[PDB]
Amino acid sequence: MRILHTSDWHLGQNFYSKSREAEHQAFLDWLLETAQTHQVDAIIVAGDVFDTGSPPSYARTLYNRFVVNLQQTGCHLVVLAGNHDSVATLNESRDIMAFLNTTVVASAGHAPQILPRRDGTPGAVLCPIPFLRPRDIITEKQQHLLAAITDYYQQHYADACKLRGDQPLPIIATGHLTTVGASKSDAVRDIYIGTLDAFPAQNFPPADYIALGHIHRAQIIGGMEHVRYCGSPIPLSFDECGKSKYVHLVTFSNGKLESVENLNVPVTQPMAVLKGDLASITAQLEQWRDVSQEPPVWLDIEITTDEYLHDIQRKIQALTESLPVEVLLVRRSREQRERVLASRETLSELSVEEVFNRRLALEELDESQQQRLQHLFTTTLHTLA
Amino acid sequence: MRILHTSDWHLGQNFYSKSREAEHQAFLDWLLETAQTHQVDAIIVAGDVFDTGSPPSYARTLYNRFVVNLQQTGCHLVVLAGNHDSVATLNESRDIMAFLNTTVVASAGHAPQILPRRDGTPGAVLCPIPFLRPRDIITSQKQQHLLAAITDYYQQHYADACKLRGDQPLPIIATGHLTTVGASKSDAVRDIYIGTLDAFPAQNFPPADYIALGHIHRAQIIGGMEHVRYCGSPIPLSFDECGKSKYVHLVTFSNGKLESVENLNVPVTQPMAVLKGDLASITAQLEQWRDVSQEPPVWLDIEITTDEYLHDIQRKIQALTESLPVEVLLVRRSREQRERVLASRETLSELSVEEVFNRRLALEELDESQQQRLQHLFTTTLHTLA
Amino acid sequence: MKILSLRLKNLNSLKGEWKIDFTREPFASNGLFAITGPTGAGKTTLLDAICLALYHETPRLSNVSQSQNDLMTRDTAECLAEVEFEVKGEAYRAFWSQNRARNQPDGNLQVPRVELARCADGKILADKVKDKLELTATLTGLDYGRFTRSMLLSQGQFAAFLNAKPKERAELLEELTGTEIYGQISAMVFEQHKWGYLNSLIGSKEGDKFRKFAQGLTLDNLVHLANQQLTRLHGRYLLQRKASEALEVEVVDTWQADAVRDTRTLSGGESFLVSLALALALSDLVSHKTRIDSLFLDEGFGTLDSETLDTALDALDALNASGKTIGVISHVEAMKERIPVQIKVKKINGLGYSKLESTFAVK
Amino acid sequence: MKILSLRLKNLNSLKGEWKIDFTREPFASNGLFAITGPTGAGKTTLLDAICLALYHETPRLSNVSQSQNDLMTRDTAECLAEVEFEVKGEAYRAFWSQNRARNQPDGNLQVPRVELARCADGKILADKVKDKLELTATLTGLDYGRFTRSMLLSQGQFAAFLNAKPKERAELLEELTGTEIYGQISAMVFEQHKDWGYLNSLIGSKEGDKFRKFAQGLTLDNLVHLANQQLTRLHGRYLLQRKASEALEVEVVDTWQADAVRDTRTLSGGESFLVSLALALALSDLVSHKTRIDSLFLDEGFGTLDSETLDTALDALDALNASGKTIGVISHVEAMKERIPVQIKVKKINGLGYSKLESTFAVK
Ligand SMILES: Nc1ncnc2c1ncn2[C@@H]1O[C@H](COP(=O)(O)OP(=O)(O)OP(O)(O)=S)[C@@H](O)[C@H]1O
Ligand SMILES: Nc1ncnc2c1ncn2[C@@H]1O[C@H](COP(=O)(O)OP(=O)(O)OP(O)(O)=S)[C@@H](O)[C@H]1O
Ligand SMILES: [Mg+2]
Ligand SMILES: [Mg+2]
Ligand SMILES: [Mn+2]
Ligand SMILES: [Mn+2]
Ligand SMILES: [Mn+2]
Ligand SMILES: [Mn+2]
């Protein structure tokens, strides 16, 4: 059977006071016609459907319009819950979606269920795993929660394997978490910020497919081809190019995985990041000097040098008058702000000489002055110690 | 065809920090089995489904569970928006409710549609009219203005329904949610149209076969005409509303005209009482429940007309109500006292200095000598300075 | 005292030539409007533009002078606020300005170059900060300390009139009704007595006691109006004047057998509701001396939960049939659909600046 | 300085007698908890009990004397607040009770009685309001002013530490790190100068001041570093920065503009709440020798944030759930009741006017 696997839509996301409604509408239309054409039998969204817990009105308009236009196909939508999605909002409309060939799961502990294909035959089973809350599964700490997620996954794969009987039914699993060796971005919020850092790929149970998504860039974990991310179908935080936006059309063969076709999503609103000094910024602005693009590409100017003190935004706007581009940001860069730490525990155990050392570091000390003033200090402590 | 008519559910209402979830659950179960038994084809909720604009989780659970259990009967729910319901919350889920034999009308300006009967035949035509805001019907712009606006809106929609009826005699059922001139008003009714047009004359209504109205929480007939009828809330939403007159109206139509309006009552599951008078009258009325085993306790409130409020009154009422299965809600003083406390505008810019002098003398208990000696000493000395 | 229009330039994060006029089409009809935007959009900036243009101040920024002009927009060489306000039938136009050194985004701040004129004559009434301050204090009647408790309730300080000390409340009630002749009467009885029946009843030293009675009567009318408003917003409390010589109101708790307690023991949301009711009653008061027409709220609606916010917003629709230009400010998503006439404030792409409408730019 | 328990009785709309304990099973695990209820339910009362038991005062009512006890519940005879607090491994407890005359619901307000025991050896330490106030001021280090600056941000005044005057901030940073030796070292150089020429000029050492100002500036720089670490999740636009002045003072850096710096009294209401929450959470995580701020309670500022900012700030609030500090947040917003697992729920009882907690906290 054929599923489409996609994740991390982030509907109703606020992107520097810009609405992404046109891009989500184009993508949902495209997904409807692609699901018609390629003869798919299910669609799986693995978490982060909505961006906030109280999404706007047009976000719920988009999602309801997509689900109601899915009804004219014979398909079957499966919706998971990410770390952004509110639990009770999805649980309120749990069973009223079940009358529309659509199943949602937000809490932890749903029994794994079979799926129909487009002719009512039981095609595959899946164990739906949403984003597990650290209060939901448990009753040092990192191995505790790691083993908790591990035995949870083992338990649900055991129940799905028992449900399959002795029939040609593949196991699909879901997830919304981060794993080892993950191309993390800035749209990705951090889960288990006190407990975990990643998840080992070998802790997953073996299955015919493991559809995850938390990281918004498509990649494969380790070398296991049956375990894939999908990432967002749109750019979310300027770190993602307009080419790596894929939806995985997965097709199975007689109980085992056959193919994972990475069909790509066309771009409606392009983005562009601009780094360096101002002359290199102008040289990168040169590549739009003539082209007529009707949706203006959103820029993110990042200054690397010390030109931050000058009247930047007036100069950049005076540059970008003529060419049809649109600017969203002017900043000193992250790579500049990476190494601005340059430090620092406390002054509790820190000695007065080290306070005195930090006093001298602002001065112009010489080897006399780091031994004439320093000897006068170090004595006069122990004239009073 | 047999429709059901009800209104003013007020789901998720907060009633003095008590939830009405058990009563609404029992009523929705009862309405399911009753609409199944009597072979109803369309239920009409004529307004005020949800109490607030952001209802709780269990209220949306109740309403979604009711709509999803409706599908086994083959009925066709119609839901309107009262003066409490948020417009955008219904307008989001309109298109997804339309796939469940459920039409939800919240904005103003929907085309009148055709109900199916239970076997797909085009039974009736209804005019869905929700609570009209004072902005989506009026231009940029008083009392006669708003009255004529509502009147020509009703006439326009009735004209379009009469046109859509055509050759076949089908009943047109107009809807609505507003207050009229013969209105047994209550306390749960928030007052709509508070700046202008505090009532609506019944003769402005167009001549439809039935006019299903809301906003008044007691069963009532407006202006003598039978086909115009409130249906009222199915549960007591305040304390002044008596716990017996709680009806759903099964309306059976025949051959394009109105035949039967049957008022079938909702059984009580949470009784409530009102106790007025002096303290000994409260004790005498509390002697009623002195022996009866009653498993949901009767939420009664105390109104005290006399001046026994100022003592440790909640001590007395609590010590009385230890032994009874009662669970008193509140101990307020009196409404009728606070009716008479308004025996007092008349600002001091109008009120003369002698009138301010007169209000000073009224606080004293002065006699006619002092009301003439001190007054004449005052009333000459205004001009001797100013 | 009625705000007619408001024109500002590059004030906090607006960076333009914005001008709203409350005598144009969308404001004269309804009266009650709202200012809606996201967090940090610029909502309070339009609200302190009027207090800058009138009193050279801001609820946050105390001094705005040649030293430390902390509000004027970054990378901007100038700022100006200018309000039009009418009183007793005639109009006036206050104005305020600032420049940097040489029209450059950095430089030295200058003298603010302030003025105040009367419309329909062009006559310049004042040109210095002192003369303009005393001229507006005698023209409108109310200075800054009464403006931030009667006509404009700033963010976080909505309880400036409810929880005031008795002398500020006494000064505001002295300004609403002129009780000068009420002092002349019982100053005479201090000398006309040589009878003491009058000089015991309204017996004053310098006319003060009869003025205390007139203040008590004006406050009792105000408290009656406040309970008329308050019976819809929050039905639990009522206001009443204390049995004391100092003018103090306090709350009757109708739920707990009309037990009486002071106003500084209410809650946050309840105190917002009571202060909103009192400020709304102060607008419906009428006198021959400096009536309050306009009213601008700032915040408080976040302190109310949902099942109280709906009742308070439904009670706020009672003024669309009025001529008062009460304007409200909030960010709460329950308010953007309840109120039809809105001023929307938008952030332009996260550059840091903002803009509000297309019909409000001057150019 | 941490709060172990809290016992109150008839303090406000909370009738009866209640006791919560932060060393019991729901609070010792998570640390971050919430106090949730409707409008007027009694949420601020549980913080006014702490302020009353410690500093004989609440942020609304400036005195609770023989006269003017506007706190006690209508038609009740008496009230008492009692807190238990640990400083440096020592578990003291404070006490504050007041009775009306002859147990009558209306009578003469009598004289309050106070304890301030030690509770390890069980000895008492004070019996008057003066002795109790000065003993707790020298015991915890926190005066009532510094308490509302640091450990308890009351309703509507979350910006008490951000928008403070320089001398209050100087007193609080002087209390966090005992810097008397930094004045003592910089006292003798005034006489060791009278080479000592350049050193006494560089290390300003007249009366033990300029070196101590340098130590305060270093503590503030560490605190501002911790604050920016917290603030990079809540509101990514601003950054705190200890500005260059002779009086220690912070200001904000607007990264969304070029890098333009401006003072803290130009922020918004919601932005100022976020910056003050970040600063308070930094002051909790800071370590020192003199005094430690473990417990932290804050009233509602969350209404000023809109929907998406509230989502971001409340998602960034879960980082303290893997700690051992007892941050206790208070709001009524409907987003907070599901995002936080451990809650104290305050329920009004039937509209009588009183209220009650959950059934575990009853003293029975
Ligand atoms: N001189 C200035 N230059 C640049 N930005 C400024 C200046 N003064 C203020 N701002 C910013 O202007 C923004 C708008 O602030 P306000 O208008 O006071 O907030 P607000 O509109 O009330 O938001 P609320 O109250 O939370 S809905 C704030 O984020 C300030 O940092
Ligand atoms: N002496 C008293 N006896 C009984 N109730 C009182 C007394 N004094 C005040 N109250 C009421 O106690 C209630 C509790 O108020 P608070 O606890 O401050 O409100 P809250 O819990 O902070 O809710 P918020 O802050 O508005 S969301 C208020 O409604 C007061 O009117
Ligand atoms: Mg503001
Ligand atoms: Mg509070
Ligand atoms: Mn995601
Ligand atoms: Mn995610
Ligand atoms: Mn109703
Ligand atoms: Mn109604």
Q: Do C182 and B353 count as a contact with CB atoms less than 8 A apart? A: yes
**Looking at C289, C315, C339, which one is the last position of a domain?**
C289
C-alpha distances in Å from residue A321, one per residue of A161, A290, A316, C356: 62, 13, 9, 22
Cβ-contact B248, B230 below 8 angstroms:
no
Same domain, C135 and C18: yes
Token pair in block for residue A173:
């699993």
* Residue B80, SS3 per DSSP: strand
**D residues 271-290 closer than 8 Å to B (CB):** none
Q: Is residue D1 part of a domain?
A: yes
Residues D131 and D224 placed together within one structural domain of the fold:
no
In a domain, C154, yes or no: no
Question: From the centroid of its chain, how far is CA A56?
Answer: 20
* Token duo for residue A107: 């809490």
Cβ contacts of residue D284 below 8 Å, gap of 6+? D293, D294, D296, D325, D327
Give the other-Cβ count within 10 Å of B64's Cβ: 18
Give the number of whichever ligand sits closest to the CA of residue B131.
Answer: 8
- Chains touching C (3+ CB pairs < 8 Å): A, B, D
Nearest CA to C114 out of C102, C125, C101 is that of C125
Closest in C198, C286, C337 to B88, CB measured: C337
Phi-psi region of C43 (alpha: psi -120 to 50; beta: other; left: phi over 0): alpha
Chain C residues with CB under 8 Å of B356 CB are 182, 213-214, 217
Subunit contact B88:A64, Cβ cutoff 8 A: no
Q: Which CATH architecture has domain B272-340?
A: 2-Layer Sandwich (3.30)
A314 touches C at CB < 8 Å? yes
Residue C190 one-letter amino acid: F
Tokens found for residue A100: 């529309």
DSSP B338-371: HHHTT-----TTTS-HHHHHHHHHHHTT--TTHH
Which residues are near ligand 7, the ion (C-beta closer than 5 Å)? B 8, 48
Nearest in space to B171 (alpha carbons), one of B261, B48, B264, B262: B261
The Cα-based distances of C210 to A329, B68, B348, B377, D285 in angstroms read: 66, 71, 13, 16, 61
Residue of A54, A373, A383 lying closest to D199 (CB–CB): A373
Cα C198 to middle of ligand 6, angstroms: 81
| Probe target for ligand 2 pocket from D12, D14, D52, D152, with the most ligand atoms within 8 Å of CB | D12
Residues C193, C253, single domain; the answer is yes
* Structure-determination technique: cryo-EM
- Using alpha carbons only, how large is chain B's radius of gyration in Å? 27
Tell me if residue B376 falls in helix, strand or coil: helix
What is the CB-side half-sphere exposure of residue A4 using CA atoms within 13 A?
27
Sheet holding A298-303, edge to edge: A271-274, A298-303, A326-332
Which residues, numbered 69 to 98 in chain B, qualify as contacts with chain C under a Cβ-Cβ cut-off of 8 Å? 86-88
Query: What span, in angstroms and rounded, lies between the C-alpha atoms of D324 and D319?
Result: 11
Taking the CA of residue B341 and the nearest CA in chain C, the distance in Å comes to: 10
Amino acid in position A284: Q
**In whole angstroms, what is the distance from residue D144 CA to residue D249 CA?**
22
Per-residue DSSP letter, B112: P
Q: How far is the CA of C17 from the centre of ligand 3 (A)?
A: 21
- Breaks following residues of chain D (C-to-N distance > 2.5 Å): 194
Question: Cα(D84)–Cα(D5) distance, rounded to whole angstroms?
Answer: 5
Q: Please name the member of D256, D300, D307 whose beta carbon is closest to the beta carbon of C352.
A: D256
In a domain, C299, yes or no: yes
The 3-state DSSP class for residue C186 equals helix
Chain A contacts of C348, Cβ < 8 Å?
17
Strand order in the sheet with B210-212: B113-116, B122-127, B172-175, B210-212, B228-229
User: Rounded to whole angstroms, what are the CA distances from B38 to B1, B5, B34, B43, B157?
Assistant: 11, 13, 6, 12, 30
Give residue D343's domain range.
1-141+291-364
Ligand 1 contact via D301 beta carbon (within 6 Å): no
Q: Are B25 and B61 a contacting pair, CB within 8 Å?
A: no
- Residue among C253, C302, C304 minimizing CB distance to D304: C302
- Residue among B55, B321, C271 nearest D350 (CA): B321
The verdict on C171 and C265 lying in the same domain is: yes
Whether C121 and C4 share a structural domain: yes
Q: Which two tokens stand for residue C244?
A: 């004391």
A313-322, Cβ contacts within 8 angstroms, sequence gap of 24 or more: A313/C75, A313/C351, A313/D257, A313/D258, A314/C75, A315/A278, A316/A281, A319/A281, A319/A282, A319/A285, A320/A285
Q: D39 and D88 in one domain? A: yes
Phi, psi of D81 (to 5 degrees): -110, 150
In sequence order, the β-bridge partners of residue C36 are C344
Q: Are residues D273 and D182 in the same domain?
A: yes
Q: Fill in the amino acid letter for C59.
A: P
Q: Inter-axis angle of helices D45-55 and D129-140, to 10 degrees?
A: 100
Residue among B54, B312, B331 whose CB faces D352 most closely:
B331
Distance from CA of B310 to the nearest CA of D (A): 11
Quickly count: other Cβ atoms within 10 Å of residue D22's Cβ.
18
Closest residue, chain A, to C106 (C-alpha): A311
**For C215, what's the count of Cα atoms within 13 Å in the CB-facing half-sphere?**
25
Helices A352-361 and A369-382: angle between axes, nearest 10 degrees: 160
- Between CA D342 and CA D339 the distance in angstroms is 10
Q: Residues of D with CB below 8 A from B329's CB?
A: 350-352
Architecture of domain A271-332: 2-Layer Sandwich (3.30)
Answer whether D255 contacts ligand 1 (Cβ < 6 A).
Answer: no
| Contact list, D300 vs chain C (CB under 8 Å) | 268, 302-303
Residue D199 included in any domain: yes
Q: Does D111 contact A at CB distance below 8 Å?
A: no
- Asked if residue A262 lies in contact with residue A6, where contact means CB atoms within 8 angstroms, the answer is no
Quick check: CB of C350 below 6 Å from ligand 1?
A: no
For atom 9 of ligand 1, the residue with the nearest CA is C12
Q: Determine if ligand 2 sits within 6 Å of the CB of residue C82.
A: no
Same domain, C20 and C7: yes
Residues in chain D within 8 Å Cβ distance of B238: none
Say how many Å lie between the CA of residue D300 and the centre of ligand 4: 7
Question: For residue D221, is it within any domain?
Answer: yes
Strand runs (DSSP E) across C111-212, as ranges?
A: 115-118, 123-126
Burial category of A72 from C-beta neighbours within 10 Å (exposed 0-12, middle 13-18, buried 19 and up):
exposed
| D165 contact partners, CB below 8 Å, separation of at least 6 | none
Phi, psi of B115 (to 5 degrees): -75, 145
Integer Cα distance of B80 and B198 in angstroms: 22
Tell me which DSSP letter residue B213 carries: -
Task: Report residues near ion ligand 5: CB below 5 Å.
Answer: A 8, 48
Q: Resolution for this model in angstroms, one decimal place?
A: 3.5
Q: Check A18 against C75: CB less than 8 A apart.
A: no
Instruction: Transcribe C70-139 into DSSP letters.
Output: -SSPSS-SEEEEEEEEEETTEEEEEEEEEE-SSSSSSS-------EEEETTTTEEEE-SHHHHHHHHHHH
Amino acid at C174: E
Nearest to A211 by CA among A241, A252, A242: A252
- Partners of residue C103 in chain A, C-beta under 8 Å: none
Q: Does domain A2-264 have CATH number 3.40.50.2300?
A: no
Chain D CB within 8 Å of residue A107 CB: no
**Which residue, by CA, sits nearest to atom 18 of ligand 2?**
C267
Q: Which amino acid is at B73?
A: T
Q: What burial letters (b/e) apply to B36-60, b meaning 16+ CB within 10 Å?
A: eeeebbbbbbbbbbbbbbbbbebbb
Give distance in angstroms: CA of B326 to centre of ligand 1: 55
The enclosing H or E element of C261 equals strand C259-261
Task: Quote the CA–CA distance of B374 and B371 in Å, as a whole number.
Answer: 6
Question: Does D350 lie in the same domain as D248?
Answer: no
Of C12, C48, C343, C353, best ligand 1 pocket probe by most atoms within 8 Å of the beta carbon: C12
Q: Is A63 exposed, middle or buried (0-12, 13-18, 19+ CB in 10 A)?
A: buried
- Do D332 and C299 make contact, defined as CB atoms within 8 angstroms? no
Residue D216 lies in a domain: yes
CA separation (Å) from A100 to A73, B243, C18, C139, C158?
11, 40, 50, 69, 50
B17 Cβ neighbours under 8 A, 6+ residues apart: D38, D347, D348, D349, D350, D351
C151 within domain boundaries: no
DSSP state of D326: -
**DSSP-assigned letter for residue D73:** P
Out of D239, D266, D271, give the residue to mutate to test ligand 1, the one with the largest number of ligand atoms within 8 Å of its CB.
D266
CB of C300 closer than 6 A to ligand 2? no
D361 and D274 both lie in a single domain: no
Q: What CATH number is given for B2-265 in this structure?
A: 3.60.21.10
CA B366 to each of CA B113, C193, C211: distance values in angstroms, whole numbers, following the listed order: 75, 19, 22
For residues A49 and A85, the answer to whether their CB atoms sit within 8 Å is yes
Facing residue for D155 by CB, picked from C268, C301, C351: C268
Q: Cα-flanking dihedrals φ and ψ of residue C105, to 5°?
A: -65, -10
User: At C248, which amino acid appears?
Assistant: E
Q: How many CB pairs under 8 A join C and D?
A: 100
Residue B178 alpha carbon to ligand 8 centre in Å: 7
Per CB-CB distance under 8 Å, the chain B contacts of D105 are: 312
How many C-beta neighbours within 10 Å does residue D207 have? 11
Helix (H, G, I), strand (E, B) or coil at D62: coil
What are chain A's partners, defined as 3 or more CB pairs within 8 angstroms? B, C, D
- Are B186 and B217 spatial neighbours (Cβ–Cβ below 8 Å)? yes
Structure tokens at B54: 């952001």
Pick the atom of ligand 1 nearest to D304's CA.
26
SS3 sequence of chain A: CEEEEECCCCECCECCCCECHHHHHHHHHHHHHHHHHCCCCEEEECCCCECCCCCCHHHHHHHHHHHHHHHHCCCCEEECCCCCCCHHHHHHCCCCCHHHCEEECCCCCCCCEEEECCCCCEEEEEECCCCCCCCCCCCCHHHHHHHHHHHHHHHHHHHHHHHCCCCCCCEEEEECCCCCCCCCCCCCCCCCCCCCCCCCHHHCCCCCEEEECCCCCCCECCCCCCEECCCCCCCCCCCCCCCCCEEEEEEEECCEEEEEEEEECCCCCCEEEECCCHHHHHHHHHHHCCCCCCCCCEEEEEECCCHHHCCHHHHHHHHCCCCCCEEEEEEECHHHHHCCCCCCCCCCCCCHHHHHHHHHHCCCCCCCHHHHHHHHHHHHHHCCC
D345 and D240 together in one domain: no
The domain spans of chain B are 2-265, 272-340
d(CA A344, CA A358): 12
Regarding the beta carbon of D36 and ligand 2, being less than 6 Å apart is answered no
Contact D250, D240 (CB under 8 A): yes
Neighbours of A335 (CB within 10 A): 10
From the CA atom positions of chain A, what is the Rg in Å?
27
Q: Assign 3-state DSSP to chain D and report helix, strand, coil percentages, each to 5.
A: 40, 20, 40
- Which among A308, A359, A363 is the nearest to D258, CB-wise? A308
Domain final residue pick, D260, D289, D318: D289
Residues D99 and D211 in one domain: no
A299, β-bridge pairs? A272, A327
CATH code, domain carrying D168: 3.40.50
**Token pair for residue D351?**
């509209």
The CATH number linked to C4 is: 3.40.50.300
Rounded CA-CA distance B353/B375 in Å is 12
Instruction: Tell me which of C289, C315, C337 is where a domain ends.
Output: C289
Buried b (16+ CB within 10 A) or exposed e, A161-182: bebbeeeebbbbbbbbbbbeeb
Q: Is B38 helix (H, G, I), strand (E, B) or coil?
A: coil
| Chain C contact for B335 (CB, 8 A cutoff) | no
CB contact under 8 A, B357 and C258: no
Tokens of A319: 């540059």
Cβ pair B21, B61 in contact under 8 A: no
What is the tally of structural domains in chain D? Answer: 2
B333-B339-B340 Cα angle (round to 5):
100
Dihedral sign for Cα D334, D338, D343, D344, please. Answer: positive
Structure tokens at B120: 């797909």
Taking each helix axis as running N to C, give the angle between helix D166-176 and helix D210-234, from 0 to 180 degrees, rounded to the nearest 10. Answer: 90
CB C97 within 8 A of CB C56: no
The number of C-alpha atoms within 13 Å of B81 and in the hemisphere containing its C-beta is 22
